[PDB]
């Protein structure tokens, strides 16, 4: 049950640079992205606990130089029912 | 300022808080060939360098003359992503 | 029939943290999420009536830390005819 | 048969409306239509008095928890509408 | 290889921004990604210094038409990105 | 800033009073395996580091850009406690 | 051995809610509690470093809702001599 | 896991009337009392989720009438780890 | 169900003189005392409901002449669950 | 006789963080801790003087960042009668 970190940006370029620097900053598996419509895009990362916290903190600072950035949050141990009911990767 | 190839990443959870959000990288000095020949040294990124890219990392008291790297406690930081290295007019390294 | 709880959020990140704290609050079943476009996203849970009351209120307090919460509602006995057409986890 | 609709910038408001509608009269809930941009529209069908009574419960019930955009009732849709639009009663 | 992206709230802005980039330097236009809600995004790829000079030639050509949300250059995206995002150059 | 594994402590009783209360530690640079291979260097703690922990110590004019290390005379200080060290995508070090 | 996380409340209730939220936040092992007398009680958790930090600063926030929070601190790796003399679990 | 209800009073008398009112107001099981020292006392009740929420709110009305109420809180479904390590009555 | 009378006084002397005045006022059995730490102590008496009502309001007027009277209360029928979990002199 | 170092903290975490940093700074044996109730706790270290003197001076700085810190003192040569009559470890 690897951790979970997410970054949601209204633009698109924001997500990519956030997606990239999140991967370049720690050992993480970039798991995909989720388009919620209205332009909002969300990057989803998963991996060991201490790494997500570094990528997240890094992606926020790395995307802000592009602008926007709506929300940023990190879940260390997602409940079994989450990864199973939602498309955050780790679904069996 | 030293030639360098990124090799890996370091993740610290208990760190001096002035630096949090900084990206810590592991660099080995390389000959102008991409051949890493040295000891691993850590430095913070300010240009968005990634693993396997050839970079310049500045060192010492002048490694803080960069935004989001100011009065932070850091003695080595990246400042460039190399694109080609000339020797006498013959290119030894490319992208 | 099993109850119904709903959180709507303008931001995918809001829904997840809303979902996580919800399943952790009481014994409810997270069945999925529904995307209305425009960045609006809704989390849906079913279970005992008392749990939904306690689970939902744990989400609003948990989602308000992140994104703006559009709506938060609780359905004790939804009609039989509803569960047939809408994607609420109890489709026969 | 007659028609009845509610649309609420917010998937929640639509559901609470659909309950109160189904719970309030002998009407058949056909489904829901998502128009994008956060706007979604509920569709009910049945006798006029039922719909005209059902919808009144919907607007009054969604206004408590939703931003209601529009609420309307058609007593007899022309045959062509049911043919093109997805309102259940479509041969 | 490197990466170039331009994001406009208008289909037109993206095209002219794309055209100017291809005409400015040796870059390959790969396609575009619709994020919904208006916003569209151009993606180019090629050597790093061309992209940097390509974008600042596209941003200049889109500033004539309307607003331009973002312009960015990644000199070498991590291998893991290219394998998970529609940025062409996928394995 | 260089990887290092703490090895020991140094105790001075006659020292410049600006520094009293500083915790003096002994670190040897380590290869990215946790196996110490280098010369002993002293540095003050600012993160609450203990013996046997793998750390980063910054050095020189930029080793003072941290409170309780300001205009004090210190040219090497710890600033982080590593948690994992990646190399090319295969983890070479853990807690 | 493992890292260390501690929360100290002037009320039994605050600590409980602080404790429950901590385990629900990350993969951490709750060991017990040490009553210092005179009101003050202390919750003790242990586990990997980043999980504790994400637990505590989620517990501290989850305890301030009820009442006062005296202190919150995190030790990444207690010296060997502590584990042998203080009830921090992991004693031989 | 049964819910959790707690009442913490700075007077043993305040606790008792609070305890009695609870077991009189809802189908709850009273486990015991935890004295954290310094005049502070904590009553602990467990049962169904709603009953606890009803018991506590019904107890507080009685305790503020004859004592310095300190904290009133409810935990709907506490973690396995809490009941396993803390003296809250549902320990194996 | 033998009724219950209690008196909580900050200081030992108050408890005794309050206690002695109770057992002299009506037919009740003094069962013991509880030390909650921090100087607060509580006297406990059991008996028929009329005695405690006459016993307590006799101890109050006798303790009020010595020390700080915290609270004075009477329960005419402790729920059997109380008498079982609490040291009130009627545990089976 | 081994030296003596002491730190007395209102909390509990204050002692621990003080205890650790005292150990990490020099060759010292953490010999135990003494709870005087009311929240006040005291850590006791013993060893060579120059080691204690560095640990003590270090422990103060480490605990103040949590707060409290009541007293900080160092005894170089405890009289034999102390070590025999008080629980400072080195007691025959």
From Swiss-Prot, chains B, F:
Alphabetic keyword roster: Bacterial microcompartment
Q: Which PROSITE patterns match?
A: BMV
Name listed for the protein in its UniProt record: Bacterial microcompartment shell vertex protein
Cellular compartments annotated = Bacterial microcompartment
The record's note on what follows loss of this gene reads: Not essential for BMC formation; when an artificial operon without BMC-P proteins (Hoch_5815, Hoch_5812, Hoch_3341, Hoch_5816) is expressed in E.coli BMC shells are made.
Assembly state and interactors?
A: Homopentamer. The base of the pyramid faces outward.
Per the record, what is it used for?
A: Artificial BMCs can be made in E.coli by expressing (Hoch_5815, Hoch_5812, Hoch_3341, Hoch_5816, Hoch_4425, Hoch_4426, Hoch_5814) or (BMC-H (Hoch_5815), BMC-P (Hoch_5814), and 3 BMC-T (Hoch_5812, Hoch_5816, Hoch_3341)). Cargo proteins can be targeted to this BMC. BMC-H can be modified to place its N- and C-terminii in the interior of the shell (called CPH). Fusing proteins to the C-terminus of CPH allows targeting of cargo proteins to the lumen of the organelle composed of CPH, BMC-P and BMC-T1.
UniProt lists the family membership as follows: Belongs to the CcmL/EutN family.
Q: Provide the BMV domain boundaries.
A: 1-83
- Segments traversing the membrane: none
Q: What else is known?
A: One of 3 BMC-P proteins in this bacteria, the others are Hoch_4425 and Hoch_4426.
Q: Could you tell me which CDD domains the record lists for this protein?
A: EutN_CcmL (cd01614)
Q: From which domain of life does this come?
A: Bacteria
Enumerate the InterPro entries for this protein. Answer: EutN_CcmL (IPR004992), EutN_CcmL_sf (IPR036677)
Its GO CC terms? bacterial microcompartment
Q: Which Pfam families match?
A: EutN_CcmL
Role summary: Forms vertices in bacterial microcompartment (BMC) shells. Expression of 5 proteins in E.coli (BMC-H (Hoch_5815), BMC-P (Hoch_5814), and 3 BMC-T (Hoch_5812, Hoch_5816, Hoch_3341)) forms 40 nm artificial BMC with a molecular mass of 6.5 MDa. There are 12 BMC-P pentamers per BMC. The shell facets are 20-30 Angstroms thick, with 1 of BMC-T trimers protruding to the exterior.
Curated annotation (Swiss-Prot), chains D, E:
Describe the inactivation phenotype. Absolutely required for BMC formation; when deleted from an artificial operon (Hoch_5815, Hoch_5812, Hoch_3341, Hoch_5816, Hoch_4425, Hoch_4426, Hoch_5814) being expressed in E.coli, no BMC shells are made.
The name under which this protein is listed is Bacterial microcompartment protein homohexamer
Q: Which Cys-Cys disulphide bridges does the record give?
A: none
Subcellular compartments: Bacterial microcompartment
What CDD domains does the annotation carry?
BMC_CcmK_like
Kindly give the PROSITE patterns that the UniProt entry links to this protein: BMC_1 (PS01139), BMC_2 (PS51930)
| Major subcellular location class | other
On assembly, the entry states:
Homohexamer with a small central pore. When purified protein is examined by atomic force microscopy it dynamically makes uniform patches about 35 Angstroms thick with hexamers in the same orientation. In the BMC the concave side faces outward, with the N- and C-terminii exposed to the cytoplasm.
The protein's organism comes out as: Haliangium ochraceum (strain DSM 14365 / JCM 11303 / SMP-2)
User: Can the keyword Signal be found in this entry's annotation?
Assistant: no
Q: Which residues cross the membrane?
A: none
């Amino acid at each position: 049950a690897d951790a979970l970190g997410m970054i949601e940006v209204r633009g698109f370029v924001g997500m990519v640079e956030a997606a990239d620097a999140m991967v370049k900053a720690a050992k993480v598996e970039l798991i995909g992205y989720e388009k919620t419509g209205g332009g909002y895009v969300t990057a989803v990362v998963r991996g060991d606990v201490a790494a997500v916290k570094a990528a997240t903190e890094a992606g926020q600072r790395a995307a802000e130089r592009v602008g926007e950035v709506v929300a940023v949050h990190v879940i260390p141990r997602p409940h079994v029912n989450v990864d199973a009911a939602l498309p955050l990767g780790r679904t069996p | 300022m030293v030639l360098g190839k990124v090799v890996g990443t370091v993740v610290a959870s208990r760190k001096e808080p002035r630096i949090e959000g900084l990206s810590l990288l592991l660099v080995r000095a390389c000959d102008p060939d991409g051949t890493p020949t040295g000891g691993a040294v850590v430095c913070a990124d300010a240009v968005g360098a990634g693993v396997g890219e050839v970079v310049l990392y500045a060192s010492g008291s002048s490694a803080r003359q960069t935004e989001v790297t100011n009065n932070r406690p850091v003695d080595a930081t990246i400042m460039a992503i190399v694109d080609l290295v000339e020797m006498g007019g013959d290119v030894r390294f490319r992208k």
